[PDB]
Amino acid sequence: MDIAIHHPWIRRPFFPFHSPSRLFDQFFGEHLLESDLFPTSTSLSPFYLRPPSFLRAPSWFDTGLSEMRLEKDRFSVNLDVKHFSPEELKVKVLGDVIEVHGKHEERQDEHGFISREFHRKYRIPADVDPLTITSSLSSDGVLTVNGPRKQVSGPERTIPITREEKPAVTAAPKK
Amino acid sequence: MDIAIHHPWIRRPFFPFHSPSRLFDQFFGEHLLESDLFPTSTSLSPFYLRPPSFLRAPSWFDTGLSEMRLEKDRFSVNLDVKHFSPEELKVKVLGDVIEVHGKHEERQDEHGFISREFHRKYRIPADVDPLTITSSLSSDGVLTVNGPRKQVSGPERTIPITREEKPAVTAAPKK
Amino acid sequence: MDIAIHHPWIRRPFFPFHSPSRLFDQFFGEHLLESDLFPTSTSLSPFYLRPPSFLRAPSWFDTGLSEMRLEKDRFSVNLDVKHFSPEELKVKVLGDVIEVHGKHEERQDEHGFISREFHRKYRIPADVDPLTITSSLSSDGVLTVNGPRKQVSGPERTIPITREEKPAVTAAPKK
Amino acid sequence: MDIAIHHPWIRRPFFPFHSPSRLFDQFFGEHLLESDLFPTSTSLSPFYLRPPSFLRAPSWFDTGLSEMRLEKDRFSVNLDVKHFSPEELKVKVLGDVIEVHGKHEERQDEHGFISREFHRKYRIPADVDPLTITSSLSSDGVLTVNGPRKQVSGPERTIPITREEKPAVTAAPKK
Amino acid sequence: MDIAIHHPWIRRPFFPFHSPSRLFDQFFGEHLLESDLFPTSTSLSPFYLRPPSFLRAPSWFDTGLSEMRLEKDRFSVNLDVKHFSPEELKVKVLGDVIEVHGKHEERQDEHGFISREFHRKYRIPADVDPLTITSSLSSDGVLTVNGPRKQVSGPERTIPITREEKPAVTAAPKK
Amino acid sequence: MDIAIHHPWIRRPFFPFHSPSRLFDQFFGEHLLESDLFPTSTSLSPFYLRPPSFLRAPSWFDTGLSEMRLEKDRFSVNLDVKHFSPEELKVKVLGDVIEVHGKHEERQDEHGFISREFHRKYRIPADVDPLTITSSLSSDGVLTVNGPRKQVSGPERTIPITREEKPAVTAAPKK
Amino acid sequence: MDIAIHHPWIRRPFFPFHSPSRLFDQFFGEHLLESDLFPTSTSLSPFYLRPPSFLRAPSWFDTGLSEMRLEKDRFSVNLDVKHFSPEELKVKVLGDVIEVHGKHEERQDEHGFISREFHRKYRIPADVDPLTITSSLSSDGVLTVNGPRKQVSGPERTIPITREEKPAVTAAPKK
Amino acid sequence: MDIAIHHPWIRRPFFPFHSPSRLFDQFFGEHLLESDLFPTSTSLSPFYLRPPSFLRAPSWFDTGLSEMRLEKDRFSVNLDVKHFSPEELKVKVLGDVIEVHGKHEERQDEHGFISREFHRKYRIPADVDPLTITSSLSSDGVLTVNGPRKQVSGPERTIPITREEKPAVTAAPKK
Amino acid sequence: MDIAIHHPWIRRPFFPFHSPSRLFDQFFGEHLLESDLFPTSTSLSPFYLRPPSFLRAPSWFDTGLSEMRLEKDRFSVNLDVKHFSPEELKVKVLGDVIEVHGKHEERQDEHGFISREFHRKYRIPADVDPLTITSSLSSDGVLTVNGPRKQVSGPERTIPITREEKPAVTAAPKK
């Protein structure tokens, strides 16, 4: 844990290409995402949906897919955060449950400040696997949890214990 | 660390592997990020990363498989509670994780009472489904979770947030 | 900050404000502390700190006013909850601070449920009195905290305790 | 947050007048308070009260005032802590509520130590404004929260929600 | 609290004999314990018990003693932790109550790990005095709280308050 | 701490004590650890340690006694609560520690209510025994804990764990 | 500078822009130098430099325009010389820069003569053309430069000379 | 001397005294030097230095009475010479200091002679007066200085020299 | 190796191994040097060194045995020379070390001749005796060293010369 040795020694080899931001693996990753999802060089390959939005000029489409084949396949789910909240949002991958918690103050009044909040609750063990599902985000709050998938889905438990039914028992007369 | 020994020596059995692009972590990282966006005419991969190999005939791809499932069928798992502890045991089915917490005082002394406890931690996704998996306790403590299976799980913490096209910051000279 | 530039430069326009007593923070601080004890034949003032001004005709005094009250009358006020959340909303009147916490799930997906939330933070002491301010809810979510008004508030953290006549300490050489 | 640069650089200019205690702004303030409240140079200006005390030689008077005029006036409330507890007391200005919590062990027995505690609860929004009310303790525990004032006073809330009375209702026959 | 001065200055005089374990005051104390409790050079004199164990070759004997004379008495109680748990063990001397909490995973399965736990609860104020009782753990988790002793033993409280019985009483007619 | 003065001076009135074995803390520490195992042929010892003394005729031993009990009898200790607080008082008998927590508001102001509190902390082992020791409250606040006694207590934190027979570690050259 | 704050913070709202090529100043600099040689198949470009933008639909190019021309028409600009100075004024038409230098002594004292001066600096290329633009003076000092227009100018100092294919230098070790 | 502890802590029980003029040693030193020149309408004082006190009713002044005389009357002081030494004793009356030097050999050995000596140092000004104070010797060694008294003395070394109006020195740059 | 982690962690699993005498290498070294002089009353040892063990019943001693002989019989070892090299092979019996050096050119190219070489290094003391062990070559290269055996060998370099008796040296201060 050489904080005064390794830390300044690991940030050194980064200098030859260090200066822009602290996060270099998402703008170039999403820039390629919006460019790879578009028929470049080759041509054709779509599939989407469309939920309610406040936008009049543009439109917010809830991205989604589905597939299965040989022995390998990718997938990507998109959370909902119409308004960006980079610092005011926290993504949590609690097992087979993906949830987003973003709150941003976009509406302002005299002495009162309004703060909207978007919270999604996804329980898709068939599309999620914490040991592989990561999380992406857009400048418009568009969260995108990419990664493989599996199966199964259910919260219920059902676990009875004891009950006996072996020693002490009851009964009644008969004939 | 003998910089005058370990450095030239640790760089000895490295030559036949050398010349792997000084920026191998980023070069291949981009190609893997491109195939992580849209199914790039591959044999459909969840995260199969094409790595540098000496294999000339076949094409190797970094994969998991042996980290999700292995040897399961269609039975019931049995927890361990050597000594009976009906009232003093609590079985919890938290997702694909089956656990048992049973504590019973079997050893006694003058003014000191000994209490033994058995705690099992089962992270069997392809063997447990919280929705159907139930529990059956015996009079000796033998706990048995019965039910079907088939699914993958595994709690990880790999969710890089922020970084989402359109930011921009600035600075200025100082002293 | 080039000490050989910013120092002599930042000390240039300062000329017409220079000669303000090397110990201005303590000199005036004592005079302000003297008038903060007993109404010293002044035009009465909570904290009218007589500062050094260039105004020859009038005498300026540091004050607040524009940081407590402004434009109010009788009012009724109105919180914001675009979408109805009767059972899923909690209005809290914590002193001169009116807040609303309403969360309703209006957007739904396959296995993911979206939940929007509206949270208003009103720091209106001039139009809020917890003793007489009530709350009325509409079927659309429109909240209305009607009632009288007139008051001032504002949570700060300026309470320098300790030091209170007759203490005494000491020390001695060391090495 | 240059703790190893700014901290030792800001305490440097304090050296020319350093060495005494570490709360220079409270003894000189109270010393002037007990000297300004006394007709010095000029003459006359009183107003006080008197609660029960254990002191036989001296007397503990609960200080208090009241006034209103143009649009600016000062004020000062005094908490109660007969026995000093500089380190064992905490003053809290929770909005329009001033409370003092001081506990000092003045009575001692064989193997039992007695500890008295003084706790005041002030709900004076008319004499308190957290955004300007400070605190000044005495060597005898005499706490004094000085600062401006305003108006209003009340804890009750009264905020009914829903009730409906619009759609589904009830009635009875008639003629 | 000179962490960057005293710390490296106190570990300096230890170097002349520093290199082995981080603890040098227990192996020698237990090695001498198992050697002093054995008739060496002189004659002999024992006293013990024997509880249920899983060991077939050896045997776990619950050590214990008892004595009283003049005004001096040695004593040592032994907690129970059959399997070693150096790191996974926490001894607590909460007053006249000695408790041990050790949990170690000795049984392993496919994807399920078993973890046994030994917890003793001693309420011996007659053999314990936190102001003198210490602890000594043995390789086989054999904990041994050595130290003097005193008397008394009991948890019950029984502290009735008020009841009145003086003012405001009840009665009934008579003749 | 003039090293050229305090060092030779602090070692001056120490000569007649010098030559106490450079490793006195370990030398005697071993002999005291040997007599702490088995009741070695002596007048027993709760923790009597043979220290280096100038006494030629008698043999001195490090003892306690005066740190456990002193002057007690049948007794019936009394707590202190100057002002009655029947409903506002809580007597707690936590082991050999008797405490009283009574708070009553006897002083009142305009909008500020004063509340006095009496808290006693009695650590009398030779006077308290949780079982029998009860409590009796008066109408003036005079609390009285009556009952027998005889026992010693004292919550300390001296329990060195680990160093439990046969461990072993290892290392290697580095830089 | 707070390298432990400003550095990671100034890189925060920079992620969505990150990955702009560690050598962005040279990468794009080469592409801009290529299009600056021969009129590459484009809508031409005085110096339009294709920059990295988030605009997906349109293609943005860095340009000037609003730094040469703006709002002009058949004009006859007029300089300012409030007080007449026929013999004491000099109008200079240095290219697309019209200037006036008039100094007249209107204020007089005992032995001190005051002299006011009006100096205008007009850099209007789209309004001036030294060849045609003339000047007309009034009796009050109102100077008026009449004539056509249409032109662009602006004195800059960006002219790299050195470097021109076929150089070569050398050196050698030293100490 | 933890500067990060002793400094802020030692500056704690000094607050109530704090703000006593950063130049207290010179400020009051001047006022004491002014009253040391001419009897400034005071109650006359050799060195009554008016110090800063918390006493509000009375005015305190630095005295010295308890450092000159105390419990004397009109008798004769007796020196100590347990063993007679008429010819081997020398009494000296050096001002207000009475001393006795008597040495007699009372213990004898083989070839070694022991000599005991009694030396008294009396600095009693209010009991001695070189003029009248005489000395009477007894046959047992009991010395007795008889005579009146009343006087004050005490050898000190506080006589600053030089610094007498009209000096002047000078210097110049160097390197 | 983080001295703030590895140091306290590499001494942790050393816990009950400590107290092995800070000078263990010299303490036991002396006892081993004493038993290396005269055959001290023991079961005779070549170099058995009584080490510190946890074994209570048996006494362990550092020994060799498994570093001299193992599994042998009459035997007639045979070297390996896949391809015959009668004239191009040299068998050397240097003590208890049998070696073979045969080189034969079996592969031929245009102007390049390949030469294979087989070299065996046998350090079998319990199988070789230079005096009797002979060598027999076959026509295929199969070398066979036949003969009896029984012996121990092994070239080492442990001969610390010097350190005789009565030398005497000296030095003196310098600078």
**DSSP conformation letters of F64-117:** -STTT--S--S---B---SS--STTEEEEEETTEEEEEEEEEEEE-SSEEEEEE
Contacts of D57 in chain H (CB under 8 A): none
- The residues near I168 (Cβ < 8 Å, ≥ 6 apart) are none
Q: Which residue has the tokens 């009530």?
A: C134
Name the residue facing G15 among B162, B170, B171 (closest C-beta).
B162
DSSP tag of B6: H
Reported resolution, Å: 20.0
Q: Nearest chain D Cα to F78, which residue?
A: D112
Contact C143, C137 (CB under 8 A): yes
**Backbone conformation region of residue I100, classed left if phi is above 0, alpha if psi is from -120 to 50, else beta:** beta
Rg (CA), chain H: 27
d(CA F82, CA F140): 7
Q: Nearest chain C Cα to A53, which residue?
A: C107
d(CA F75, CA F124): 12
- Three-state SS for chain C is CCCCCHHHHCCCCCHHHCCCCCCHHHHHHHHHHHCCCCCCCCCCCCCCECCCCCCCCCCCCECCCCCCCCCCCCCCCCECCCCCCCCCEEEEEECCEEEEEEEEEEEECCCEEEEEEEEEEECCCCCCCCCCCCCEECCCCCEECCCCCCCCCCCCCCCCCCCCCCCCCCCCCCC
Contact I12, E21 (CB under 8 A): yes
β-strand pairing of B89-94 with A144-146: unpaired
Strand partners, I91: I100
d(CA I144, CA I124): 14
Contact E130, E118 (CB under 8 A): no
Contacts of F172 in chain B (CB under 8 A): none
A–I CB contacts, 8 A cutoff, strictly below: 4
- Three-state SS for E44-78 is CCCCCCCCCCCCCCCCCCCCCCCCCCCCCCCCEEE
Q: Which residue has the tokens 């690991």?
A: A10
Q: How many residues comprise chain E?
A: 175
Q: Nearest chain G Cα to A140, which residue?
A: G16
E150: phi then psi, degrees, rounded to nearest 5: -145, -100
| Touching chains A and B? (3+ Cβ pairs < 8 A) | yes
Tokens of I79: 């070297």
Neighbours of chain C (3+ CB pairs under 8 A): A, B, D, F, H
Q: Nearest chain F Cα to B4, which residue?
A: F175
Tokens of F143: 């609390």
Distance set, CA G135 to CA B150, G123, G124, G131, G146 (Å) = 95, 16, 15, 12, 6
Tokens of F12: 């001056």
B–F CB contacts, 8 A cutoff, strictly below: 4
How far does the CA of residue F109 sit from the closest CA of chain C (Å)?
Answer: 21
Nearest to B131 by CA among B117, B145, B110: B145
- The residues near B28 (Cβ < 8 Å, ≥ 6 apart) are B21, B49, B50, B51, B52
Element of type H or E holding F24: helix F24-34
How far does the CA of residue C119 sit from the closest CA of chain B (Å)?
Answer: 23
- The residues near H44 (Cβ < 8 Å, ≥ 6 apart) are none
Contacts of B2 in chain F (CB under 8 A): 175
Contact H96, H151 (CB under 8 A): yes
Contact B100, B119 (CB under 8 A): yes
How far does the CA of residue F172 sit from the closest CA of chain B (Å)?
Answer: 10
State chain E's maximal CA–CA distance in angstroms: 96
Handedness of CA H145, H150, H154, H155 (dihedral sign): negative
CB within 8 Å: E155 and F130: yes
D110: phi then psi, degrees, rounded to nearest 5: -55, -80
For residue I115, give the CATH number of its domain: 2.60.40.790
Distance set, CA I8 to CA E22, E30, G86, H119 (Å) = 6, 21, 94, 64
- Three-state SS for A123-174 is CCCCCCCCCCCCCECCCCCCCEEECCCCCCCCCCCCCCCCCCCCCCCCCCCC
d(CA B57, CA D118): 86
SS3 G25: helix
d(CA I19, CA E27): 7
Burial class (CB in 10 A: 0-12, 13-18, 19+), D108: exposed
Q: How many Cα neighbours within 13 Å face the side chain of E70? A: 8
The residue among B30, B34, B163, B170 with the most chain G CBs within 10 A of its CB, best to mutate, is B163
| Boundaries of domain holding E124 | 75-153
- Angle, alpha carbons A138-A143-A148 (nearest 5°): 120
Distance set, CA C80 to CA A108, A110, C85, H86 (Å) = 11, 13, 11, 113
SS3 F32: helix
Contact H19, C26 (CB under 8 A): no
CB within 8 Å: E139 and F165: yes
Tokens of F74: 């049948």
d(CA D126, CA C152): 9
Contacts of G2 in chain D (CB under 8 A): 1-2
Handedness of CA F133, F137, F138, F142 (dihedral sign): positive
d(CA I84, CA C142): 104
Q: Nearest chain I Cα to F160, which residue?
A: I15
Element of type H or E holding A30: helix A27-31
Element of type H or E holding H113: strand H113-122
E–H CB contacts, 8 A cutoff, strictly below: 4
H31 belongs to an annotated ligand binding site:
no
SS3 content of chain E, % helix, strand, coil (to 5): 10, 20, 70
Contact G13, B167 (CB under 8 A): yes
Q: How far is CA B32 from the centre of its chain?
A: 21
Distance set, CA H145 to CA H89, H91, H119, H123 (Å) = 14, 9, 15, 13
Q: Nearest chain B Cα to C2, which residue?
A: B175
Q: Which amino acid is at E123?
A: R
SS3 B122: strand
Distance set, CA D117 to CA D80, D84, D90, D91, D134 (Å) = 10, 10, 12, 13, 22
CB within 8 Å: C134 and D160: yes
d(CA G91, CA E137): 103
d(CA F68, CA F156): 13
How far does the CA of residue I8 sit from the closest CA of chain E (Å)?
Answer: 6
E–I CB contacts, 8 A cutoff, strictly below: 47
Tokens of E115: 């973890």
Q: How far is CA H109 from the centre of its chain?
A: 43
Contacts of E26 in chain I (CB under 8 A): 15-16, 18
In D15-125, which ranges are E strands?
76-78, 89-94, 97-108, 112-122
d(CA I84, CA I102): 8
Q: Which residues of F3-38 are buried (b: 16+ CB within 10 A; e: fewer)?
A: eeeeeeeeeeeeeeeeeeeeeeebebeeebbebbbb
DSSP tag of A29: H
How far does the CA of residue F101 sit from the closest CA of chain D (Å)?
Answer: 10
Q: How many Cα neighbours within 13 Å face the side chain of E122? A: 28
Q: How many Cα neighbours within 13 Å face the side chain of I82? A: 8
Strand partners, E90: E101
Name the residue facing E30 among I8, I12, I16 (closest C-beta).
I16
Technique used by the depositors:
cryo-EM
- Angle, alpha carbons D46-D47-D51 (nearest 5°): 135
The residue among D114, D116, D150 with the most chain F CBs within 10 A of its CB, best to mutate, is D114
Distance set, CA G63 to CA B168, G48, H28 (Å) = 21, 5, 74
Name the residue facing F117 among D51, D111, D119 (closest C-beta).
D119
B104 belongs to an annotated ligand binding site:
yes
Tokens of B61: 């791809």
Q: Nearest chain A Cα to I4, which residue?
A: A1
Contacts of C145 in chain D (CB under 8 A): 159
β-strand pairing of H97-108 with G97-108: unpaired
- Three-state SS for B23-71 is CHHHHHHHHHHHCCCCCCCCCCCCCCECCCCCCCCCCCCECCCCCCCCC
Q: Nearest chain A Cα to G55, which residue?
A: A31
CB within 8 Å: E139 and I17: no
Contacts of B146 in chain A (CB under 8 A): none
D31 belongs to an annotated ligand binding site:
no
Distance set, CA F80 to CA D55, D80, F144 (Å) = 20, 21, 9
Contacts of F35 in chain E (CB under 8 A): 74
Contacts of C3 in chain B (CB under 8 A): 175
SS3 G49: strand
SS3 content of chain F, % helix, strand, coil (to 5): 15, 20, 65
How far does the CA of residue B161 sit from the closest CA of chain A (Å)?
Answer: 6
Q: How far is CA A168 from the centre of its chain?
A: 52
Burial class (CB in 10 A: 0-12, 13-18, 19+), C150: middle
F158: phi then psi, degrees, rounded to nearest 5: -130, 85
Distance set, CA D41 to CA D23, H31, H52 (Å) = 29, 21, 20
| Touching chains C and H? (3+ Cβ pairs < 8 A) | yes
Name the residue facing I16 among F164, F171, F174 (closest C-beta).
F164
**What is the end-to-end Cα distance of chain D in Å, rounded?**
82
How far does the CA of residue A8 sit from the closest CA of chain I (Å)?
Answer: 16
CB within 8 Å: H19 and D25: yes
- The residues near B6 (Cβ < 8 Å, ≥ 6 apart) are none
β-strand pairing of B136-137 with H143-146: unpaired
d(CA D158, CA C132): 8
Q: Nearest chain A Cα to G21, which residue?
A: A17
d(CA D62, CA F112): 11
Q: Which residues in D have their CB inside 8 Å of a CB on F?
A: 51-52, 62, 64, 77, 79-80, 98, 103, 107, 109-124, 126-127, 153
Q: Which amino acid is at E59?
A: S
SS3 I107: strand
CB within 8 Å: G11 and B171: no
Tokens of D24: 């220079």
β-strand pairing of B97-108 with A97-108: unpaired
Contact A121, A155 (CB under 8 A): no
d(CA F105, CA F137): 18
d(CA C12, CA F137): 77
Nearest to G117 by CA among G108, G105, G133: G105
| Touching chains F and G? (3+ Cβ pairs < 8 A) | no
Neighbours of C55 (CB within 10 A): 7
Handedness of CA G9, G14, G19, G22 (dihedral sign): negative
Q: How many residues comprise chain I?
A: 175
G15: phi then psi, degrees, rounded to nearest 5: -55, -65
- The residues near D136 (Cβ < 8 Å, ≥ 6 apart) are C160, C161, C164, D26, D29, D30, D33, D143, D144, D145, D146
Q: Nearest chain B Cα to C3, which residue?
A: B175
F83 belongs to an annotated ligand binding site:
yes
Strand partners, I104: I116
Strand partners, H113: H108
Contact I148, I77 (CB under 8 A): no
The CA dihedral of F142, F148, F149, F150, to the nearest 10 degrees, is 150
Contacts of C167 in chain H (CB under 8 A): 12-18
Strand partners, I116: I104
Distance set, CA F16 to CA F11, F53, H95 (Å) = 10, 11, 42
d(CA I31, CA D1): 62
Contact C123, C154 (CB under 8 A): yes
d(CA A113, CA A115): 7
* DSSP string computed for I10-47: SSSTTGGG--S-TTHHHHHHHHHHHTTTS--SSS--SS
